[model samples]
Target: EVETFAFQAEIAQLMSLIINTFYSNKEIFLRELISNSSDALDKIRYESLTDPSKLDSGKELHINLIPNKQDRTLTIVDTGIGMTKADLINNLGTIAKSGTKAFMEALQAGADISMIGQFGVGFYSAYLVAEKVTVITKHNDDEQYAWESSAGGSFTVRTDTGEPMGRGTKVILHLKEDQTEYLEERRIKEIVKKHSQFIGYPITLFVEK
Candidate 1:
């Protein structure tokens, strides 16, 4: 079933104010995204232990960042469990996360959600610095796909023509002029250690020389 619930003007204004004004640390955007990618890697690696065939065929689990100051772009790549269109939408767009619900339910049912990690609106944190974002993913169950968004009113999804890149995902962030401070390697490395060190995977930043 589809629901067309509309937020009143006041509600919209309140939300915008809270998000834009209260969330001051914009540099955490990279850390948040990388952490989410690390969660993905953890999930895939754990699942692979149960089903050997499900392991990522082309690459091992890892996180990498590419910052291009000239093009004003930053890219994060991970070899982990990739998502489908529905997975992307729910993970990136919506607020109430199904993963969180599943996690709680699993715990209630005496199962586990330890590998899932926090499941709030971490992915949307990309808009904190990026004007444009692209996600390239290849899943074991389906063909590879790409999702692109500007964090505007909507997003678009399409198939990728590039060679299949094993099984994982890549996120490309196109930064706006004012947020170019993120393009610095030293800055990125420090930020990763400060915020992403807790993440299960190692994070590497690739600088454009």
Candidate 2:
């Protein structure tokens, strides 16, 4: 069954700010997504310290960047601590978690917007370059679900039994026409090399040689 939910007051305003009021830092989208993936990986590894069963059977802790020019999409896949339905609806659907106030205040002051990390709205940064975002996530305690939205009023979460997605999350960004430059292998590498050098987990770019 698929469920649709609306973004709350803060999320709508926060998303608007990220997608429109913000520019010149569109490339930071990759950094945000990558950072989220790394955090997930870290969480799973930490959990395995006590419950070794938390680790999936055929997965490793890493991030995969797959850019498909043909599909006009950039997919960020990871074998990390994926999310349950609650995480999809509450965690992402109603972002900011009250930190939107500070984010808004800072942005209005023309001050540093680095509070984005603390505000937990980095996931929404995907909207900077993507027209639509689809998150395919599988949590150890719950079945896989695909949460999709267009950075609009609402988002849909549906059970996804299509692919053999293991325990992790895969964020697929449908690049806007002009933002297709992100799909280029060279460009993705440069972005990763420049921004994510300090990340802990291994980051892999899927390319055909």
Candidate 3:
């Protein structure tokens, strides 16, 4: 069951505005994503305590960054609770919380211009550096699926039979030409140390020299 969806226009515009406004600090996208991965890992661990079935056998709970210089791709993988189709639509399609609407409204109204971080919409930050973004995931109770977007108005979701993630999410970023800095292992390590050192889970980066 594959579906196509459009993001909330106002919210999507706000996200794009924020990302473009902070073009000088594009590395923040990595930090935001890693922070998100840490939160997901925490949620799955908590859930596994109550329902052991949620824990996938032989899967170590960790976050991995795989950089492919040749393909200009950077993949962030987390062994956390993956998303269902509805989750993808709701979580990524619209604002995550009530405050987001008010935030966007305030931004549009030219109110105080410094309250963007409270909305919990960090996922969209990927568009800061990626020309296209693809998310491949498998929830414990759902089939594996791929969600893709080009930062355009709409996104598409399709059933993925190529490979099963077991139970987790993989975000594959197609880097823009000028954003190749993200593919360098050294630059990635520096950003992770500065922004994600306090994250609860282990973060590993794999890149060829």
Candidate 4:
């Protein structure tokens, strides 16, 4: 069964700041997410070459955008390393990262944001446009997990039973009114190619808006 989790209050503020200012172009949010997805694909690709048997059988190494205009939901699915329950907490709940404190301490000593992608915390940007974010992930290591949150102040994570998602993570976004542009395909494609063409992975648009 899936278990629920809570977030520290500060995560909400940080999320707002990110969605509101981190990227001047709101459309780039998709690209940022896709860029992160490409990184995930690369990880498994490297693992597969060394241990072919260890690869995700799904093997779909691209980002898929499924847009539903009626209800205003956009689902971004990928075939990457899905996160387990713990990975959910460690990767999302904490600010910046679990080691962010130490990272900052080191930064005060001179570390830069340029070198921080290893923290795996960028995915939360989804919370900006989304009223709610649902993550359906099937990992190679253990049971699959579904994480749901509104970024208000808490989240939930538990073993999923709906259906086994093949390898990777899928984000279902219940978008807000201001985020309607995301419901269009041409804009999405343009943004993806602009910021993510060099991502080294194919980005697919499943159901274009």
Go through the candidates in order and give each one's C-alpha lDDT.
0.69, 0.84, 0.80, 0.70
Model 2 agreement with the true structure over 1-209: per-residue lDDT tens digits = 88888888778777777777746768888998999999999999999989898875444899999999888999999999899988888865554656677767767787554447656667878888999999999999999999998977788999998886878999999999999889988999999999899999889899843
State the lDDT of candidate 1 residue by residue for 1-209, as single tens digits.
21222333332332243235444578877767887788888888888889888873754778888888778889899988888766754534344445445544654676422222354545656767788888899878777888876543456677788878788888888887788889898888889878777787767778588
lDDT of 4 by residue, 23-135 (tens): 43456457557767787788888888888775646766777889989979888888877676667776545545454444445546764433334444556657557888888
The candidate that wins on lDDT is: 2
Output the better candidate (2/4) by TM-score.
2
Model 2, global lDDT: 0.84
Question: How does residue 204 of candidate 3 score in lDDT?
Answer: 82
TM-score of each: 0.77, 0.93, 0.88, 0.80
Model 3 ranges with Cα > 4 A deviation: 95-99, 105-117
In model 3, what are the clashing residue pairs, if there are any?
none
Pick out the ten consecutive residues of candidate 1 with the lowest summed lDDT: 1-10
Q: CA lDDT of 126 in candidate 4?
A: 73
Winning model by TM-score:
2
Task: Give the range where candidate 2 is weakest over 10 consecutive residues by summed lDDT.
Answer: 111-120
For each candidate in turn, give its C-alpha RMSD to the true structure in angstroms: 7.5, 1.7, 2.6, 4.1
